[PDB]
Design an enzyme around this catalytic site. Structure first.
Site, mmCIF file in Angstrom:
data_model
loop_
_atom_site.group_PDB
_atom_site.id
_atom_site.type_symbol
_atom_site.label_atom_id
_atom_site.label_comp_id
_atom_site.label_asym_id
_atom_site.label_seq_id
_atom_site.Cartn_x
_atom_site.Cartn_y
_atom_site.Cartn_z
ATOM 1 C CE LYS A 10 -3.491 2.586 2.538
ATOM 2 N NZ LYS A 10 -4.344 2.664 3.750
ATOM 3 C CE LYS A 11 2.817 5.125 -4.740
ATOM 4 N NZ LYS A 11 4.234 4.886 -4.412
ATOM 5 N NE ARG A 12 -0.348 4.404 5.958
ATOM 6 C CZ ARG A 12 0.224 5.144 6.912
ATOM 7 N NH1 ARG A 12 1.538 5.297 6.995
ATOM 8 N NH2 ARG A 12 -0.572 5.762 7.788
ATOM 9 C CB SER A 32 -8.735 5.402 13.775
ATOM 10 O OG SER A 32 -8.050 4.306 13.171
ATOM 11 C CD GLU A 61 -7.983 13.497 4.179
ATOM 12 O OE1 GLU A 61 -8.257 13.723 2.969
ATOM 13 O OE2 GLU A 61 -7.726 12.338 4.586
HETATM 14 O O1 LIG Z 1 -5.373 -2.296 11.248
HETATM 15 P P1 LIG Z 1 -5.422 -1.264 12.384
HETATM 16 O O2 LIG Z 1 -4.424 -1.662 13.504
HETATM 17 O O3 LIG Z 1 -6.767 -0.758 12.791
HETATM 18 O O4 LIG Z 1 -4.650 -0.065 11.704
HETATM 19 C C1 LIG Z 1 -5.217 0.798 10.720
HETATM 20 C C2 LIG Z 1 -4.748 0.381 9.294
HETATM 21 O O5 LIG Z 1 -3.290 0.311 9.301
HETATM 22 P P2 LIG Z 1 -2.442 -1.019 8.885
HETATM 23 O O6 LIG Z 1 -3.178 -2.219 9.571
HETATM 24 O O7 LIG Z 1 -2.495 -1.121 7.409
HETATM 25 O O8 LIG Z 1 -1.033 -0.736 9.447
HETATM 26 C C3 LIG Z 1 -5.238 1.382 8.265
HETATM 27 O O9 LIG Z 1 -4.809 0.982 6.921
HETATM 28 P P3 LIG Z 1 -5.560 -0.069 6.039
HETATM 29 O O10 LIG Z 1 -4.945 -1.338 6.552
HETATM 30 O O11 LIG Z 1 -5.162 0.233 4.553
HETATM 31 O O12 LIG Z 1 -7.056 0.069 6.269
HETATM 32 C C4 LIG Z 1 -4.714 2.769 8.588
HETATM 33 O O13 LIG Z 1 -5.151 3.693 7.584
HETATM 34 P P4 LIG Z 1 -4.124 4.593 6.830
HETATM 35 O O14 LIG Z 1 -3.498 5.661 7.744
HETATM 36 O O15 LIG Z 1 -3.106 3.766 6.085
HETATM 37 O O16 LIG Z 1 -5.017 5.208 5.710
HETATM 38 P P5 LIG Z 1 -6.049 6.505 5.680
HETATM 39 O O17 LIG Z 1 -5.429 7.559 6.648
HETATM 40 O O18 LIG Z 1 -5.928 6.946 4.204
HETATM 41 O O19 LIG Z 1 -7.351 5.934 6.080
HETATM 42 C C5 LIG Z 1 -5.240 3.179 9.951
HETATM 43 O O20 LIG Z 1 -4.859 4.549 10.259
HETATM 44 P P6 LIG Z 1 -5.885 5.722 10.558
HETATM 45 O O21 LIG Z 1 -7.254 5.069 10.778
HETATM 46 O O22 LIG Z 1 -5.873 6.645 9.378
HETATM 47 O O23 LIG Z 1 -5.281 6.306 11.789
HETATM 48 C C6 LIG Z 1 -4.724 2.199 11.019
HETATM 49 O O24 LIG Z 1 -5.242 2.626 12.293
HETATM 50 P P7 LIG Z 1 -4.337 3.251 13.470
HETATM 51 O O25 LIG Z 1 -4.831 4.684 13.610
HETATM 52 O O26 LIG Z 1 -2.928 3.242 13.051
HETATM 53 O O27 LIG Z 1 -4.724 2.432 14.749
HETATM 54 F F LIG Z 2 -7.539 8.897 5.301
HETATM 55 MG MG LIG Z 3 -6.390 9.379 6.786
HETATM 56 MG MG LIG Z 4 -4.303 7.433 8.346
HETATM 57 MG MG LIG Z 5 -6.942 8.604 3.457
#
Ligand SMILES: O=P(O)(O)O[C@H]1[C@H](OP(=O)(O)O)[C@@H](OP(=O)(O)O)[C@H](OP(=O)(O)OP(=O)(O)O)[C@@H](OP(=O)(O)O)[C@H]1OP(=O)(O)O
Ligand SMILES: [F-]
Ligand SMILES: [Mg+2]
Ligand SMILES: [Mg+2]
Ligand SMILES: [Mg+2]
Ligand SMILES: [Cl-]
Ligand SMILES: [Cl-]
Length: 134
Positions: A10-12, A32, A61
């Site tokens: 995944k690209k972040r 979160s 955000e």
């Molecule tokens: O699986 P979790 O432990 O709930 O982790 C979550 C996933 O991270 P990971 O499992 O990939 O490390 C998720 O990414 P996805 O797995 O792609 O859903 C990631 O969201 P991220 O920050 O990458 O994306 P975005 O900010 O664009 O939603 C998310 O970050 P965010 O909700 O934005 O703070 C992680 O939650 P976290 O805040 O780090 O507790």
């Molecule tokens: F996001």
């Molecule tokens: Mg985000």
């Molecule tokens: Mg995030």
């Molecule tokens: Mg996002």
């Protein structure tokens, strides 16, 4: 929609959001899933989105800050969770009060001395702690 490199990571993008050009205090945000835990704000690049543009968008955000984008620190992989994050310095110049993640999910933000940010990230987020090594 999530984006990926050719190896399926995944690209972040993320920023180290500093209070001043001295880079002594950095803004972390609450997890979160786990409100009692701290993370570096960041998230997924969108299709064709420049990493610098994604970084500044995600910290608006998630952290409710804007500022002057600095250098790319590096690209950091989380082998376990299969993602690669571009990490930039951001010198904060605007602190906004009612930002997207404050309103939507009750996300918190806090200033940490660099040493203390490393400490609170080490256990759950050791790759994010490593953002600060250089
Ligand atoms: O699986 P979790 O432990 O709930 O982790 C979550 C996933 O991270 P990971 O499992 O990939 O490390 C998720 O990414 P996805 O797995 O792609 O859903 C990631 O969201 P991220 O920050 O990458 O994306 P975005 O900010 O664009 O939603 C998310 O970050 P965010 O909700 O934005 O703070 C992680 O939650 P976290 O805040 O780090 O507790
Ligand atoms: F996001
Ligand atoms: Mg985000
Ligand atoms: Mg995030
Ligand atoms: Mg996002
Ligand atoms: Cl500072
Ligand atoms: Cl990570």
């Amino acid at each position: 929609t999530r984006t990926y490199d050719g190896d399926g990571y995944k690209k972040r993008a993320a920023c180290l959001c500093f209070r001043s050009e001295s880079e002594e205090e950095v803004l972390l945000v609450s997890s979160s899933r786990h409100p009692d835990r701290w993370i570096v704000p960041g998230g997924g690049m969108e299709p064709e989105e420049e990493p610098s543009v994604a970084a500044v968008r995600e910290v608006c955000e998630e952290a409710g800050v804007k500022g002057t984008l600095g250098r790319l620190v590096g690209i950091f992989e989380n082998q376990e969770r299969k993602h690669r994050t571009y990490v930039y310095v951001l010198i904060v110049t605007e602190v906004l009060e009612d930002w997207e993640d404050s309103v939507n999910i009750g996300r918190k933000r806090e200033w940490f001395k660099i040493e203390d940010a490393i400490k609170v990230l080490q256990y759950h987020k050791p790759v994010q702690a490593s953002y600060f090594e250089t």
